[PDB]
Structure formats: C-alpha cells, structure tokens
C-alpha cells in the first residue's frame, strides 16, 4: 500500500540488532521499512513547507520611462546639470556632443549633455529569504495489512483509521511519535537541517510563479535592486541595466527602455527548482531529510488471530511492480472474524515449503461481510513460483515467473545506490542502515572527498563537467606513472558518471 | 545541589548560533517550583542518554517559582550533528543544529 508503483521506493531492513534503522527520506519517492517482527511501514515525505519568509531584493524586470529631459552644455562652462536629476526616480548618464556653430555655442568642439528620463517600474521579481528555522516537513506513512485501494486519493479518513498516519516535523520539534492504535509507536528522530541545505537558497516570486534559487545566483543578476526596505516610492538601485543610451551620429542622445526580461530570466534560470504555493506558508516540492526511525513498540495485532478457512478469490490479477515485488488483491467471503490469511508461495503444488520473502508479513482482515479485500504483496524468488493464498483444498494459486536474475538484482541495486550517492552526496552513506564501522568511516571519507570536490569543481555545469571529464580521462591515460594518471582517470570517471545521473 | 526539577519545558524564542560556534537557548520551564537546576545535553545518539559537546554556562538554573522564568544557555555543539536535551528524561523538547565547521 501507499508506495507500490513509485519506481523510487527502497526496501530497508536491519538484522535484529535493536531498532536503529536511520532511513533517509527523499521527496517524490517513498521508502519502506520491514523487520522480522514489526509490521512493515512505508514513509513518504509528501510536502515541505516554509512558514514565515523575509523580504530581500525585489527586482525590476519590466520598465517604462516617462519624459526625457536633456540639458546640453557648451564646450566651456563645463559639464551639464539638468535640474530633474538629483531625485532617484530618474536615471542619468553623460555623453559628449560636437556642439559647433549653427547650433549655439560659438566655440565648436565637443560639449556635453546629460539626456535622461524617469525610471518607473511594473512587475517586481520579489526575492524572499528563508532560514532553516520555522520550516515544516510533512511526512505521511502507512502500514501494510488491511486497506484495499488505499491508493493515495482519500487520505483523510485513513489518518483517523489505524493504518495510516501523518507526522509533521519542525526543527523546533524533530522528535515525533504518532500513534497507530494496535500497531504501536514509530519514534521518528529526524534531522530538519541537513536535507536541502537551506539558507543558501532564496524563494523567488515572479508573476504568480515561485521557485528556489541559490543566493550567490540571486545577488549577481544585473537588474535594478529594490533593496528590501518598504513603502515609499521605491529607491531603485542600479537602474542602468534596463535603460540604454544610444546617441545619434554625434548629437541628440536618446534612451531605449528595453522591455520585459521575464523570459530572459526564465531561460537564465535553468537549474533552479520550482515551488508550488505561497500563502504565509510557502509550500514546496523536492528536498530530502533523514530520520532515525525507532521501532520500540510495533505490535503486530494479528499474531493472536486465528487463521480463517474459506475460498479466496482475486479481483486484480497479481501485477509486478518495477522492483520485482508483486502486489495482489485477494477478496473473500464465507468465513468471518478478524482472521489471518495464509499468504505463502512455493515452487511445487505438493509441498507447501514457503520460499521467498513476504513483504506484507502478517496480513489481517477487518472481520466484515462479503469480500473483505486486503491487497497484500510478496517478493518471489528469481525463477518460477506459485503464489498460494487459501488454506485447504480450495487454496487459490497463481504461476508467477519473476524473470529477474539474482545477479541482476545486485546490479540494479548497485545502480540505485550509485544514484543515491550521486544525488544525496554524503547522506547515501548512513542510508546503509546501521551505525557500523564502515558507515561512519564511509561518511567521513566521503565527507572530506565531497567537500574537496565541491570546493574545487564548484558547480561545474553539464557540458562543462562532461568536457572536463573527457579531458581528465584523456590525461588519465596519456602519460607517466599510475599515481597521477589513476587519480585523473578517477575524477574524470566521477564527472562523467555524475553526468550519467538523473538526466532522463 | 538545587534538585533536578522535572517539569514542562517550552521555548520562549527560537534558538540561534553565534559566529564563534555557540548556541543560545531560552526556555520557560512553565513554573513548577522554586530555584532549581535545569540540565541540558548535546545528543549525537537518541533523544536522551548520551552527552557530547560542552555546556558553556555552568550550573544553569531557574531562579524563581512562577510561570515563565527565562534562562538563557550558551552551548558548544560538536562539529557534526547534535540535538539539544533539556531536563526531563521523558517530557522535553529537542532540536538539531548541524554545527557546519
């Protein structure tokens, strides 16, 4: 339930060892957690939210100019003044004009003029500052077991129901323990700082569009500053990027307004990331976090239940997800009580001989009338298998044929973990879920290597990192001893592999 | 001495982080009883049970009995990640800091 068919879920499991698991939650794709005991859960990060936001520089990306005033001065009597200067609403620049005869100024040879006009503005660009404080992660979670067609849509009665829960996590309140009556505790101890690396990011507000920029990007764009300070007709800083001053061949300098750069900043934006909503609760998408998920009490509630004997009929044909696990809905009637179901799978019809992993482990029933439905899921072995769900002579079966190899599972897991290591950076170490030796050691060595890498190649862009990766590869053979050549080949492989990432 | 004083701890203000790597926390204590100590911890482990870092202000305390006595604490987290633990072993509120140096 709640995570099937997301193409980004991951199966995390710790051999008994106490409850420690410290799973890393991403946005867009959930995670699912299982154990020997402990009814399996799955945590999705659905929404992050930053509540109150400061007001850094707005900008102006579309200007209009009012009346143009000029004031040209002779070649003596110095430079020019223009009384409608010395207020900040007008933007001025000074040039030189021939100023000969049949033009006044009886000395010919290059006087000056200061021809200049008003800088009005419409459609500010409205940067906002966000801090790692007073944001709000909003993770939701489910458990397997009951709940046919949980299937996100209704999601409001289910948090009153026992299976699904909704955990809101602030850095003011990182510890969180939402109840599941009949299941248990779920002691989330999460880290709402290290995830998206905020306070380097600003929240930008165009015409009813919002995203997150890096702040060094935000300070360096050449448009007029609003500064941030309020009410007053606004003191535009710069002012000189938008209006442009072209002189006719020697005389009568004029001003083009150079209209809206909305599309210009939209196409100069390329690598930012969008954010949907802006109330006084700016609500936003993709960005990860980490949780030590403590499992201290997850009672199963179904182990005491007696398994029930009647005919089990499918409605869904059992369908394979992208990961190899198989979800299968199984309704029935005929017997009653909150019963267990058997859910095993075998290689042969004769011996029951349960082979392979049961994801849903201990599925139950809600006691009810005709066709309780329950939609459990399984994990077959790599070859052929019979999924068997009934009890006795009317046990319902299905041939499966998983068709994925054993070494192919390890290869796809290596690709998935390498995508974790490319996207997350250091935090993919300790997604490997125990506080072991070469998890803290791995976090340390990848901390120093990732810090040195981000310091040297400070955001090397797409084509840039492809080209420098090819150059470091070509230097990576080329030459002398296997110390310098090997590290050149290594950094080139890291760059080309980081371009082999999420591009699709 | 100033006995441990289990109570309810609600923050007055959102804590912060000086440029000389220290943390400033202001708590209310919700006014149980009298002048008595409030312990704080840096936790790299769970919500409880492991101190790291270093408290700057030694013997932090509540002076007066009534509702909100505001004690401010200067703290020194370790270089990695850490939570802040305030007095009660069970009923308390925590943080995260990510020292960043």
């Amino acid at each position, epitope marked *: 339930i709640r995570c099937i068919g997301v193409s980004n879920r991951d199966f995390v499991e710790g051999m008994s060892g106490g409850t420690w698991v410290d799973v890393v939650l991403e946005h867009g794709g959930c995670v699912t957690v299982m154990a020997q005991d402990k009814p399996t859960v799955d945590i999705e990060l659905v929404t992050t939210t930053v*509540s*109150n936001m400061a007001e850094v520089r707005s900008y102006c990306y579309e200007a209009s100019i009012s009346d143009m005033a000029s004031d040209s001065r002779c070649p003596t009597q110095g430079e020019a003044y223009l009384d409608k200067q010395s207020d900040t609403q007008y933007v001025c620049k000074r040039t030189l004009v021939d100023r000969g005869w049949g033009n006044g100024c009886g000395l010919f040879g290059k006087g000056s003029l200061v021809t200049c006009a008003k800088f009005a503005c419409s459609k500010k660009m409205t940067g906002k500052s966000i801090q790692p404080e007073n944001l709000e992660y909003r993770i939701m979670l489910s458990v397997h077991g009951s709940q046919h067609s949980g299937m996100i849509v209704n999601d409001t009665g289910h948090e009153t129901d026992e299976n699904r829960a909704k955990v809101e996590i602030t850095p003011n309140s990182p510890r969180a323990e939402a109840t599941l009556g009949g299941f248990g505790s779920l002691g989330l101890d999460c880290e709402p700082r290290t995830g998206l690396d905020f306070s380097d990011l600003y929240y930008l507000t165009m015409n009813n569009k919002h995203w997150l920029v890096h702040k060094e990007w935000f300070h360096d764009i050449p448009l007029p500053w609003h500064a941030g*300070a*309020d*009410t*007053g*007709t*606004p003191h535009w800083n710069n002012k000189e990027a938008l209006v442009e001053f072209k002189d006719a061949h020697a005389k009568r300098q004029t001003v083009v307004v150079l209209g809206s750069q909305e599309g210009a900043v939209h196409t100069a934006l390329a690598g930012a990331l969008e954010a949907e909503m802006d*109330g*006084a*609760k700016g609500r936003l998408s993709s960005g990860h976090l980490k949780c030590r998920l403590k499992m201290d009490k997850l009672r199963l509630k179904g182990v005491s239940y007696s398994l029930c004997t009647a005919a089990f009929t499918f409605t869904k044909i059992p369908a394979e997800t992208l990961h190899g696990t198989v979800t299968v809905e199984v309704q029935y009637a005929g017997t009653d009580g909150p019963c267990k179901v058997p859910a095993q799978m075998a290689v042969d019809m004769q011996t029951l001989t349960p082979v392979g992993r049961l994801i849903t482990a201990n599925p139950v029933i809600t006691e009810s009338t005709e066709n309780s439905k329950m939609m459990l899921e399984l994990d077959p072995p790599f070859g052929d298998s019979y999924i068997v769900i009934g009890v006795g002579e009317k046990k319902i079966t299905h041939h499966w044929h998983r068709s994925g190899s054993t070494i192919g599972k390890a290869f796809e897991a290596t690709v998935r973990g390498a995508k974790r290591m490319a996207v997350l950076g250091d935090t993919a170490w300790d997604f490997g879920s125990v506080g072991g030796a070469l998890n803290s050691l791995g976090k340390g060595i990848h901390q120093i290597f990732g810090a040195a890498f981000k310091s040297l190649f400070g955001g090397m862009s797409w084509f840039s990192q492809i080209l420098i990766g090819t150059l470091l590869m070509w230097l990576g053979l080329n030459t002398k001893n296997g110390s310098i050549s090997l590290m050149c080949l290594a950094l080139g492989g890291v760059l080309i592999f980081l371009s082999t990432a999420v591009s699709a | 001495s100033y006995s441990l004083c289990t109570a309810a701890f609600t923050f*007055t*203000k*959102i804590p912060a982080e000086t440029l000389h790597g220290t943390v400033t926390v202001e708590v209310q204590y919700a006014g149980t009883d009298g002048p008595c100590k409030v312990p704080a911890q840096m936790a790299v482990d769970m919500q409880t049970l492991t101190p790291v870092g270093r408290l700057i202000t030694a013997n932090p305390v509540i002076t007066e009995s009534t509702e909100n006595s505001k004690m401010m604490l200067e703290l020194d987290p370790p270089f990695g990640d850490s939570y802040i633990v305030i007095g009660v072993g069970e009923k308390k509120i925590t943080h995260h800091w990510h020292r960043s140096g």
Partner: antibody, heavy 132, light 107 residues
C-alpha cells in the same frame, strides 16, 4: 506618566500634504517604536506605518507606498507624520502608539511583544479632514 | 494581507452576562493577537496582549484564549462601563491587520 500627545485637528485641501505631530512623555523617547494607525469614521482601524524614534527608520503599509513619510525629532522627543497626495478618502482620525520592543532599528516581530504592544500612549486622535 | 475576520459584527446583552468574541486569521498567527476595547472618540480601556494575558490595571472580568488561528475573547460579567467597540489585532509579518470591530449595547 507614559503618554503620547498629538496636535489638533487639521483641515486640508485635496492634493496637499498634512503633518501630524506625536510628542512623548514619561519614558525614554528612543526606546519605543511609534506606530501610526488611521481610522475612518465608519471603517475600523487601519495601520498606516511605523517609525523608530532612534535613527528615524520607517516602514509602512502597501496602501500608502510613496504617500507617507515619517520624521523624528530627538531633541523635542516628537514624531512627525507627513501624508502627501491627500484624497477625500484620507478624512480620518490618526493615532500613534509605541510598539515597545525597539532595541536597535525598525519593526521587530519574531522577538517578544505585548504590554502596550502599542495599546497605551495613543495621544488623542488627530482628526484630519480633507475637503475644500 | 493576513485577513483577520472578527465575529460577530455587534452584540447586546444585559448587565452581568458572559459574552465571547471570535477572531479567525486566514494565516497562522501562533499566539500573536491582541485585544482592544475602544470607547467612541475616547482614550480606550485595555483588554489583552499576546491573546491570553491580562495587563496590570485591567479588571479580571476579561480573558482571552486561542491556540492555532481561532481566538476567543470572553467577558465573564458585563458591566455598564464595558460598552465599547471591540477589536483584535494581528502581530505577524507586517501589514498589521485589525478586525472590523464588535460593538455592544446596554439592555
């Protein structure tokens, strides 16, 4: 005692500018933000803006951008509000009351409030009438 | 900007009654709300700072509460000198908004 006292009522023409004073007594003048709040006869209260009497910083609402400017006088302990581009909508009663926490400069809000957030020294209520 | 709806518009009650006022912001104001009563054209009388606290000098018949966005002001015993126009005030984010008002009348 702690009290803000304002000037008398004024009658101005549309398109002109009015100036309302706000003098302090009983407290340190550079320790409390002076907030200006209008009130039309019928329509309730409406916050015009804020000055700090230390350093003369100002901010105001979006409905008055470019129309209002606030100056100070640390010697006489007085706050001047000049409202320009007067309309028939500006016929109201203007008030000024100390925000309070006024440590450094400008509005401060995630820090503490209350205790005459600004509900104590409100001078009197300067009637400003804009007509011919 | 941070709309602050004040319910109801006006009321009337006899001397010694309990009455409640509701203020709902469209946004989360934490505990940042304040409460005025203003006699018409006069220096007012003080009710509530920080949405739950009385000030020294205020008689204790006034009280306030409210946690998320809904806030309830409560007069325990109405008195003939409590006829005024009742306002509530946001504190958060700036363009500090007042309620429309709540008038009372002596029966």
């Amino acid at each position: 005692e702690v009290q803000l006292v304002q000037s008398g009522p004024d009658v101005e023409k549309p398109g002109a500018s009015v100036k309302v004073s706000c003098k302090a007594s009983g407290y340190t003048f550079t320790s409390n933000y002076i907030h200006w709040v209008r009130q039309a006869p019928g329509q309730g209260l409406e916050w015009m803006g804020v000055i700090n009497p230390r350093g003369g910083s100002t901010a105001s609402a979006q409905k008055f951008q470019g129309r209002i400017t606030m100056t100070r006088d640390t010697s006489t302990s007085t706050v001047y509000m000049e409202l320009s581009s007067l309309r028939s909508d500006d016929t109201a009663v203007y008030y000024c009351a100390r925000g309070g926490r006024a440590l450094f400069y400008d509005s401060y809000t995630t820090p503490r409030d209350g205790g005459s957030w600004w509900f104590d020294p409100w001078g009197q209520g300067s009637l400003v009438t804009v007509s011919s | 900007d941070i709309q602050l709806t004040q319910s109801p518009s006006s009321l009337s009650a006899s001397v010694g009654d309990r009455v409640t006022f509701t203020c709902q912001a469209s946004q989360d104001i934490r505990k940042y709300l304040n409460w005025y009563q203003q006699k018409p054209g006069k220096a007012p009388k003080l009710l509530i700072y920080d949405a739950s606290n009385l000030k020294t000098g205020v008689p204790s018949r006034f009280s306030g509460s409210g946690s998320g966005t809904d806030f309830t002001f409560t007069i325990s015993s109405l008195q003939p000198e409590d006829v005024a126009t009742y306002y509530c005030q946001q504190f958060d984010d700036l363009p500090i908004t007042f309620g429309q008002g709540t008038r009372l009348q002596i029966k």
